[PDB]
C-alpha cells in the first residue's frame, strides 16, 4: 500500500523502517504527506492578549469565608498502589473532587483505584484510559479530555484544576492550600523556563514534528513555529482556574483551535501548550510564573537519555527525594504546596518524615510505619504477563516456603504441615523494612496432605547475603539487570535471572584517590567468562558494565571477583536459574537441553581466559562439568530438584503464614504477623471520612 506522496525525509523513512505495525506505518505516511502539502500545521496564529509581552504577576494562615473546591486530576501508572493511597489520604478533603486516570497498561493499579472510587462519592475514575508514555502527545489529550469531563460534571462545582502523579506529595496542609488559592482564585499558576527561548524551543524539539503511535513518539521532520504568537513553556505541573479551563475547552477562536492542532503532533505537549495558550489569550494577565511545586531536578543524574527507546528524542526526569532533602520543604522563599518525585521503593523515610511533619505522628503501637509492600504480580493479570524466568522462580519460592512449613513441625507421627503445591502463584509482593529490601512475599495455594484440604498461604523469602570483602574504597558490589542510572539501583530488585539474561555488574565506591581494579566473571563450573580493568576516578561513586556474554549462560551460581593487582578485594555471587517453563508451559527435553547447556559457541567471549584459572585457583573439575551436562538434559521432577537446590542455596524461606484456617499447628495467621501483605498497614488504609472532612 504505497504512500499518498513520495516520502523522502530521512526521519520519516527511519520511522517507517522501525515501526512495528501496518496501522502505524499508514499513519506515519499520512502525517508526513499532509505536512509536506502544508495542510497539517498552522502557519500563523492570532494573538488576543493586549499586553506587549508577558504578565508575571505577584498569608496562608487566615480562614476564608468562601473556600475554593479543588478538582484533583491524578494521572497515575505503575505498581505503587499503597503509596498512592498514602498520598491520597494526605490530600483528601470531603469538599474537593478527585478524578483518577490510570494508564491503560496498569491494570493492577486500576483495580486498586476502583476500590477507592467505590468508597467515596467525590472520587471518580476516568472510564477512558490512555497509554501515557513519557513525552507522549497523549498526555495533553488526557488533560484536555479530563477538563471537558470535569466541566460537564455539574454536580462538582470546582474552582481549580490541579494535576498530580503517584510520585507527587503535598508539602503543605490542605488548609493552607485552600487559604492560598482562595485569595488568588482568578490566577493561573504555570512555571516558565525563564531562560533563552530559542534554546528552549530547540531542546524541547518544538520545531520538530512528532507522531504518537504504537506507544512510541516518532520524529517525522521539521516544522515552522507559527507566526504572530509567543511560544513559551516549562513545567507540565500547574494549577489552572475554572475560567481558564473553560476557555481552553470550549473556545473556537483562532488561538485555541490552531494550538490544539499544533500540539497533537508535539513532544512533551503539556510542557508548553498551556503556557502558549495562556500567554496569547485574553487571560494572559492572570498568569503567575510559579507552579507552586518543588521539582527535584538533578541534571547530572536525571539526563541519561533513558527514554531513547520510547521517544525519538533525549529527555530528563526529576530525581527521587531523600532524607537529606527534608529542609527544602521548609523554604519560605516562594509559595509551594507540592513536590516530586517520591518513590517508596527508593526511599520511604523522607515520605514518612514529610507526612508526620504535616499531619502529626501516628499513635504509639501503630504497625507497619517503617514497612512498604508493593504488588509486582496479581493473579487477574495472568501468568502470560509474567516471564518464564519470574514464573519459574516464584514457583520455586513457594515450594521453598512449603518445605519450611514441613520442617518446622517436630512431631513423632503424621506431619500436619506437609503440603502439595497447587496451580500458580496468586500474588507476589516486594517487601521493604526501614528502606532495606527484605525479599518477596508469595501468596500461593497448596493442599494440606494430612487433612487433604486446600489452604491459602503466604511465604516470605529473603536473599542470602553474598557480598564478601577481603583484606580500600569499595563499599558494595552487585550483579543485576535493569540498572536505573538516575536512582543508581537495579529495578529487578530480587536479582532474578535466567539463562538468556544479560547481567550487569555494579560497584559502589567511597571517596579516595583514583584507583584501578580488575573484575572477573566466573561461571558455575569455574569457567572464566570475562576479565577487564576499570578506572575508579577519585569522584566516582558508582560504576557498572554489561560484559558481552554469549547466550545462554550456564545455569547455577556465578561468582564475580574484584582484584587489585591480583590481591583479592571482594566478591559477590548471583544465580542464573534454569527454567521450568517455556511459554508458561512445562519445559520439554529438547528446549531444556538447548537452554541449560551453556552458550552456543564453545565459550562466552571471543577471547579466552583459560590462562587465569590456575592463577586465581579456579580449577575445572571434570566431574562437575559432567554433572552439569547431565543437569542440562533434565526435565520434570529432576529439573525441579536442581532448581530448588540452587534457589535454597541463595534464598531463605524466612516464614510462612496461612491467610485463613489451617491444620498446621505452628502456622501463624497472616494478618497477625508483622511482615505479611495481609498484616495491618494503617498509613495506607482508607476509612470513614472524619467530622473535619479528612481521612488523615
Amino acid at each position: 500500500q504505497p504512500p499518498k506522496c513520495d516520502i523522502s525525509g530521512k526521519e520519516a523513512i527511519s520511522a517507517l523502517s522501525r515501526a512495528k505495525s501496518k496501522h502505524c506505518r499508514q499513519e506515519i505516511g499520512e502525517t508526513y504527506c499532509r505536512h509536506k502539502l502544508g495542510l497539517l500545521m498552522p502557519e500563523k496564529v492570532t494573538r488576543f492578549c493586549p499586553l506587549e509581552g508577558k504578565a508575571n504577576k505577584n498569608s496562608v494562615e487566615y480562614m476564608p469565608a468562601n473556600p475554593v473546591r479543588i478538582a484533583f486530576v491524578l494521572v497515575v501508572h505503575g505498581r505503587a498502589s499503597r503509596q498512592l493511597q498514602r498520598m491520597f489520604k494526605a490530600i483528601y478533603h470531603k469538599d474537593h473532587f478527585y478524578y483518577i486516570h490510570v494508564d491503560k497498561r496498569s491494570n493492577y493499579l486500576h483495580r486498586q483505584v476502583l476500590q477507592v472510587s467505590r468508597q467515596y462519592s467525590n472520587v471518580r475514575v476516568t472510564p477512558w484510559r490512555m497509554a501515557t508514555i513519557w513525552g507522549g502527545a497523549s498526555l495533553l489529550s488526557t488533560y484536555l479530555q479530563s477538563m471537558r469531563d470535569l466541566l460537564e460534571m455539574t454536580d462538582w462545582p470546582w474552582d481549580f484544576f490541579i494535576n498530580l502523579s503517584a510520585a507527587d506529595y503535598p508539602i503543605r496542609t490542605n488548609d493552607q492550600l485552600v487559604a492560598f488559592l482562595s485569595r488568588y482564585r482568578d490566577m493561573n499558576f504555570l512555571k516558565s523556563h525563564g531562560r533563552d527561548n530559542a534554546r528552549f524551543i530547540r531542546k524541547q524539539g518544538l520545531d520538530r514534528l512528532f507522531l504518537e503511535c504504537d506507544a512510541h513518539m516518532w520524529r517525522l521532520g521539521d516544522r515552522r513555529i507559527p507566526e504572530g504568537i509567543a511560544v513559551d513553556g516549562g513545567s507540565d505541573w500547574f494549577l489552572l482556574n475554572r475560567r481558564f479551563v473553560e476557555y481552553v475547552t470550549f473556545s473556537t477562536d483562532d488561538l485555541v483551535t490552531k494550538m490544539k492542532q499544533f500540539y497533537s503532533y508535539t513532544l512533551l505537549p503539556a510542557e508548553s501548550f498551556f503556557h502558549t495558550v495562556l500567554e496569547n489569550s485574553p487571560h494572559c494577565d492572570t498568569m503567575v510564573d510559579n507552579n507552586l511545586r518543588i521539582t527535584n531536578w538533578n541534571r547530572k543524574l536525571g539526563c541519561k537519555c533513558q527514554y531513547k527507546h520510547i521517544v525519538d528524542w533525549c529527555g530528563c526526569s526529576p530525581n527521587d527525594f531523600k532524607p537529606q532533602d527534608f529542609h527544602r520543604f521548609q523554604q519560605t522563599a516562594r509559595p509551594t504546596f507540592f513536590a516530586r518525585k517520591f518513590e517508596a521503593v527508593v526511599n520511604q523515610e523522607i515520605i514518612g518524615q514529610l507526612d508526620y511533619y504535616l499531619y502529626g505522628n501516628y499513635p504509639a503501637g501503630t504497625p507497619g510505619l517503617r514497612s512498604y509492600w508493593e504488588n509486582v504480580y496479581d493473579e487477574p493479570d495472568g501468568i502470560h504477563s509474567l516471564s518464564d524466568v519470574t514464573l519459574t522462580l516464584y514457583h520455586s519460592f513457594a515450594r521453598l516456603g512449603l518445605r519450611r512449613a514441613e520442617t518446622s513441625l517436630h512431631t513423632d507421627g503424621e506431619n500436619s504441615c506437609r503440603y502439595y503445591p497447587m496451580g500458580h502463584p496468586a500474588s507476589v509482593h516486594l517487601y521493604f523494612l526501614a528502606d532495606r529490601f527484605q525479599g518477596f512475599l508469595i501468596k500461593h495455594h497448596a493442599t494440606n496432605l494430612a487433612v487433604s484440604k486446600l489452604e491459602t498461604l503466604e511465604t516470605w523469602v529473603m536473599p542470602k547475603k553474598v557480598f564478601k570483602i577481603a583484606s580500600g574504597r569499595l563499599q558494595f558490589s552487585e550483579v543485576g539487570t535493569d540498572w536505573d542510572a538516575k536512582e543508581r539501583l537495579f529495578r529487578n530488585f530480587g536479582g532474578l535471572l535466567g539463562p538468556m539474561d544479560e547481567p550487569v555488574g555494579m560497584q559502589k565506591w567511597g571517596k579516595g584517590p583514583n584507583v584501578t581494579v580488575t573484575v572477573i566473571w566466573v561461571d558455575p563450573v569455574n569457567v572464566i567468562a570475562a576479565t577487564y580493568d576499570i578506572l575508579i576516578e577519585s569522584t566516582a561513586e558508582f560504576t557498572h558494565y554489561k560484559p558481552p556474554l554469549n547466550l545462554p549462560l550456564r545455569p547455577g551460581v556465578w561468582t564475580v571477583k574484584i582484584l587489585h593487582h591480583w590481591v583479592p578485594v571482594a566478591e559477590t555471587k548471583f544465580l542464573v536459574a534454569p527454567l521450568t517453563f517455556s511459554n508458561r508451559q512445562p519445559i520439554k527435553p529438547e528446549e531444556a537441553l538447548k537452554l541449560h547447556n551453556g552458550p552456543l559457541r564453545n565459550a562466552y567471549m571471543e577471547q579466552s581466559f583459560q590462562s587465569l584459572n590456575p592463577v586465581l585457583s579456579l580449577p575445572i573439575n571434570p566431574a562437575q562439568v559432567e554433572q552439569a551436562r547431565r543437569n542440562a538434559a533434565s526435565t520434570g521432577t529432576a529439573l525441579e530438584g536442581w532448581l530448588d537446590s540452587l534457589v535454597g542455596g541463595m534464598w531463605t524461606a524466612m516464614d510462612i503464614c496461612a491467610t485463613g484456617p489451617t491444620a498446621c499447628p505452628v502456622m501463624q495467621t497472616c494478618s497477625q504477623t508483622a511482615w505479611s501483605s495481609f498484616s495491618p498497614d494503617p498509613k495506607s488504609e482508607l476509612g470513614a471520612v472524619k467530622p473535619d472532612g479528612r481521612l488523615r
Binding site: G194, K203, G234, W313, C316, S317
Partner: peptide, 7 residues
C-alpha cells in the same frame, strides 16, 4: 524547568 534535552 523543562524535560527535553535535545536530539
Amino acid at each position: 524547568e523543562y524535560s527535553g534535552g535535545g536530539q
